[PDB]
Symmetry: C3
Subunit: 114 residues, 3 copies
């Protein structure tokens, strides 16, 4: 999996270790070794949620398979919890777009995963 967070929360409010924690928690959650996992956090965004400039986050999680009803509910609990715990972002001000990618549509190391 690769996971991207865009948030209006200031860089300084992103606690040390947060990328490793994302990397670790997603490894566990998806069942994939941590060497495959990309994580990307973008603070200080100019964004709004429901007209409010209170803290929020717009996210995406890409995965080849392992995408579905129950699984995505389980990810959302997990990631929202992390965003609430570490960045003080309320889960009802979080969106996470989930993408089930086909292996041939994901590039890596001069090729694709197909």
């Amino acid at each position: 999996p690769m996971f991207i967070v865009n948030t209006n929360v200031p860089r300084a409010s992103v606690p040390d270790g947060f990328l490793s924690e994302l990397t670790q928690q997603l490894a566990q959650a998806t069942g994939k070794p941590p060497q495959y996992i990309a994580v990307h956090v973008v603070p200080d965004q100019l964004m709004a949620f429901g007209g409010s400039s209170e803290p929020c986050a717009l996210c995406s999680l890409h995965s080849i398979g392992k995408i579905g009803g129950a699984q995505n509910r389980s990810y959302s609990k997990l990631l929202c919890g992390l965003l609430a715990e570490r960045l003080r972002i309320s889960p009802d001000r979080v969106y996470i777009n989930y993408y089930d990618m086909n292996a041939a549509n994901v590039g890596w190391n001069n090729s694709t995963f197909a």
Copy 2:
């Protein structure tokens, strides 16, 4: 809907009430309460359109349903309009990727909209 703008237009060139106007114009456009509308503007971007570095925008609109031929035509007229007027980007230098998301693939509030 959620709507993201990425652009090479300077930050000080984005009007103060732009997020709200995006929020409000989209809520009217899509019939969705504003409370659900997320907006996101990313200025000062290193980007080029047609080999050119004059102002441009790369955008996306994610929505659960409410995506398709006429609606997307209408959204583009609406959104290009706003980018034309407020950010003074020409419409033939704007891309807008539309995404019809399944409710099960959008995380919010420790679950999904499924």
Copy 3:
């Protein structure tokens, strides 16, 4: 084609002419008129790949058709080579998401491409 690269490489390490080279090279590789090609580079990102903060990149390539098995392998080799040459990013620290967009779902010039 529109191509976006996010990377933890510092802005000063992005060489002069890189966007033009990407436009040019994407134009060559897709045969598509360069006037419609969009490129977008985002340096200094806070990101990790395999748990590591060594140079990496997360990218996307949107296109209306001309997305497929061999083509994507060809794009990956082209694009990873550029990122290796120009930004000194190892190709095994690069993800590229490929998207075959429907024309009805791509907004441009107050309309869509349908």
